[PDB]
Amino acid sequence: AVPSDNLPTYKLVVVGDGGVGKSALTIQFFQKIFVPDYDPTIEDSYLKHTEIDNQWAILDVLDTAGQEEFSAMREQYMRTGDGFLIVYSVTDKASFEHVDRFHQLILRVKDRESFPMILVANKVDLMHLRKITREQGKEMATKHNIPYIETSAKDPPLNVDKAFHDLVRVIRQQ
Amino acid sequence: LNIDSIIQRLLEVRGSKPGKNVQLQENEIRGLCLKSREIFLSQPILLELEAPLKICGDIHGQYYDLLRLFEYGGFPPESNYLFLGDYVDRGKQSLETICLLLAYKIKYPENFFLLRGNHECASINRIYGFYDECKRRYNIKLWKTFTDCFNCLPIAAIVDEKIFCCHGGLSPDLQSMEQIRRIMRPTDVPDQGLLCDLLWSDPDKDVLGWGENDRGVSFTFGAEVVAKFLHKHDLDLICRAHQVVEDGYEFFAKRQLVTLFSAPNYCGEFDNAGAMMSVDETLMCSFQILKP
Amino acid sequence: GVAFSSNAEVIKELNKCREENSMRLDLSKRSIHILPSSIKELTQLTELYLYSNKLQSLPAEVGCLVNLMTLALSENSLTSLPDSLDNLKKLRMLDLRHNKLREIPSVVYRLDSLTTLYLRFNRITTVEKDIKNLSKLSMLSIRENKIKQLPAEIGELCNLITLDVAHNQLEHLPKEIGNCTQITNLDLQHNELLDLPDTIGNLSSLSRLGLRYNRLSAIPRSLAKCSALEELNLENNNISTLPESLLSSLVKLNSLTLARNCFQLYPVGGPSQFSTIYSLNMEHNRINKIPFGIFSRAKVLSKLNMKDNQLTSLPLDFGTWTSMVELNLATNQLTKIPEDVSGLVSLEVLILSNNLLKKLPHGLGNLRKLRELDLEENKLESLPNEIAYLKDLQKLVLTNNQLTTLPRGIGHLTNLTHLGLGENLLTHLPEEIGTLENLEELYLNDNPNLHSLPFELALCSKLSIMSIENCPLSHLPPQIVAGGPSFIIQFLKMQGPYR
Ligand SMILES: Nc1nc2c(ncn2[C@@H]2O[C@H](COP(=O)(O)OP(=O)(O)CP(=O)(O)O)[C@@H](O)[C@H]2O)c(=O)[nH]1
Ligand SMILES: [Mg+2]
Ligand SMILES: [Mn+2]
Ligand SMILES: [Mn+2]
């Protein structure tokens, strides 16, 4: 089944503030379950063998701290990454403006004017708490010229597979 | 919940005519599940274990094969036990079997340990008989209590940092025991992933690498996978259950992997024997094989 | 051993770091068994990362690098630290999670400059009394360890910001730990605590308090002084009442979970205690009767969970929960649903499985937004005709019910996608199911009372999997039934009267 040798490895870093669903979205994609407990993250490294667009790959997803208390190691984890998911909760206004700061930080750490990342709008199933609309997400997505994906991690998952799969296509584009 | 009285009412039948039933009020059985799940959740998913230990495999609903194990190896506390999953389905006396195993876990948390196997899913026990036994004996709700408790079982265990114990086998997503400790519970076994393979995989010799099982839930592995797993993480034995062997214990891939099946005369149509393993401080493993 | 009866890569990285004089040397994920002695030469290295490597012991040359502040050794097999490491007067960050450490080394106790310490997933059994030297410490975390008691000196940690002590077998907490007054992140999950110190209420600023899966009997009244809390979790705690701690904490409260406790009634207090609440988990603990008007001031509320309880009759104020989105009343002893249910206009998901529901009320036709109706094991004789008006249903199951006929209003549920009707002794069904073309999955397993399938159903061709393995099908020939659901699909395609 899985190819024996020479399997490309993709390091995907899930970056955002606290409560933007970085952990739940990663747990859902890997274990097909939704965790309703809020556990602050320091560094979580998962692994999976999955086939994307008739191609096999290893999705080494590295959840990050988010909160400044645990972010003493955060800048180191960004440095080894290959792609970024700037995850913001549609119900959390503050994380939306912090997308600019995160993009600036990613450009600073990797020392590049443009890097492969995709803005991700999480918690889209919370429609009656939504505060960042699709056009607001897209206008900032095209402001930095990055793709935009709507995503909910609560069962049934919405684009959770798509969000990771789309970046893998984005990374192989360059 | 008097763990001791329960144990007495369940061991009273020992040595009698096989197939005799033990009548337990339902709130002991629900109480056993509720009390034991906290013991499962408090302890780590990846269990660390200390010698001396007596290990085992599968006893599908067979309460008089279970009592034979406790005689040959010895009842607790004068011994420590590890059970690698699959204690329900197929066999006729399953409520009595699981109740006794769940009783020794509560009263001896640091000497009694139980892993998770494939038939601990809410869906698998529907087809293979555990669903029927709950109906006629006690209730429909009591079956849901068991599958809730089965979700919190530890997936793997490590003995003296040398022995790796899992019901099914390895996974292609397993490159470090750190991942196993990151699994979130209560959880249900999915169709694919890291968890599934551990409650569902099985070694198959023909496949040099990886290949699909005859069943359609997960996929096999080979002799090179276990060795590279042992040399990388510095272990030396992978102990497994899941399947049915004739002699009770069989050795795979130069001993690095040994399978243990302890329910002889399976479901009333097999000539297989039962086996149990004891490991001492110097890590010498010895086998106590039950008569076919 | 059980019996039966990287070095080349790392040295190059050091050499490179030594040339560029970089403040950072990363050797992480290189699986190094032994850190080389050459590390001593690079004195001016602000930070060193050696995580996820196979190191068992550090070399004693770490002491040479005085100009160092960050050290990362997590996810290794360390057991002890060199004593020469005390020479680092500038180290402020040390990472030692997921290691084989058996006790906190005495070396760590002789570092004044340290600020953040990560000792998680180890085999630590005791914590010594010589932590007074760690006055500059601010981040201390112990997540999977076997400590049994916390030293009394811990109360002098004034600079500590977060204390993470979970899964750590603690029987008690020091009474003077509340003198820190600088901790906002305290977690004590999956411990064995029996009671809480009364001085914990002197913590003016506390936001996160993980206190679940510990054998508490009650909570201190002083804890209500922490006004920065957001989420109070109390799962698997032997609690029966609260001393009105919610009212004094009604400042930033977001969610409350009281799951799997030994509760018998709602906490004693005014209805205002749920003013700013968002979610609730009262499952696995008996509740009996919910008091009237207790949810009046919960202007915002999204979810309720009431599984595994002893609910007998919902309160008469059920119709005023207009702002409630979801409900869950599975595994209870409910008898009759009042007509006040028509007021829950915003409700989206309603689950009522494992109850005693003879007949659904006619007010069900008023609630447009409903998407789920799970009524498993309810003993339903027949559905009311009000199902026709509703439109937004997408998945409902009626397994284990005594219904024999369905209302004519089936074709109006054009949004319906998942329906479960197996084990229901069903005899005949209305032809309106043909209008529902968006169906994908359907269950009629174990029903002895149906003989013929409708011809109008032949027009539904988007069905993917049909579970009819155990079905008599007296009228239809056994060959098509035992041939497979797909063969029946073709039998519907052209063998039926419709095209
Ligand atoms: N409704 C809904 N809730 C979500 C979704 N994703 C995450 N959540 C909520 O987030 C909570 C977990 O938060 P978590 O992901 O741990 O926070 P984080 O963003 O990773 C940052 P931290 O490091 O502090 O944990 C869960 O309780 C869950 O209810 C979603 O798609 N929908
Ligand atoms: Mg997180
Ligand atoms: Mn098995
Ligand atoms: Mn088996």
Author numbering:
A (entry chain B): 5 to 178
B (entry chain C): 7 to 298
C (entry chain A): 63 to 67, 86 to 579
Q: Paper's wording?
A:
RAS proteins are GTP-dependent intracellular molecular switches that are anchored to the plasma membrane, which activate the RAF kinases through direct binding and membrane recruitment, resulting in RAF dimerization and pathway activation. Prior to pathway activation, RAF is trapped in a catalytically inactive conformation by 14-3-3 through its interaction with a specific NTpS (pS365 in BRAF) that is required for 14-3-3-dependent negative regulation, and a phosphoserine (pS) C-terminal to RAF kinase domain5 (CTpS). Genetic knockout of Shoc2 suppresses the growth of a subset of KRAS-mutant cancer cell lines and inhibits tumour growth in mouse models of KRAS-driven lung cancer, demonstrating that SHOC2 function is critical for RAS–RAF pathway activation. Here we present a cryo-electron microscopy structure of the SHOC2–PP1C–MRAS complex to an overall resolution of 3 Å, revealing a tripartite molecular architecture in which a crescent-shaped SHOC2 acts as a cradle and brings together PP1C and MRAS.
We next determined a cryo-electron microscopy (cryo-EM) structure of the 126 kDa SHOC2–PP1C–MRAS(GCP) complex to an overall resolution of 3.0 Å. The structure reveals that SHOC2 adopts a crescent-shaped architecture that is approximately 50 Å wide and 35 Å deep with 20 LRRs, and acts as a cradle to bring together PP1C and MRAS, with each protein contacting the two other proteins to form a three-way complex. PP1C did not undergo large-scale conformational changes upon complex formation with SHOC2 compared to its individual crystal structures, whereas MRAS differed only in its dynamic switch I and II regions. Our structure reveals that SHOC2 and PP1C interact predominantly via two large patches of charge complementarity between the two proteins. However, the SLIM-binding site in PP1C in our structure contains density for a bound VxF motif, probably from SHOC2 residues 64–66 (VAF) in the N terminus. Therefore, in addition to the predominant SHOC2–PP1C interactions via charge complementarity, our structure reveals a previously unidentified canonical PP1C binding motif in the N terminus of SHOC2. Our structure reveals that MRAS contacts SHOC2 primarily through these regions, providing a molecular rationale for the GTP dependence of complex formation that we observed biochemically. In the GTP-bound state, key MRAS–SHOC2 interactions include E47–R177 and Q71–R288 hydrogen bonds, and an R83–R104 π-stacking interaction. A stretch of residues on switch II between Q71 and Y81 forms a network of hydrophobic interactions with SHOC2. The MRAS–PP1C interface in the ternary complex consists primarily of portions of switch I, as well as some residues N- and C-terminal to switch I.
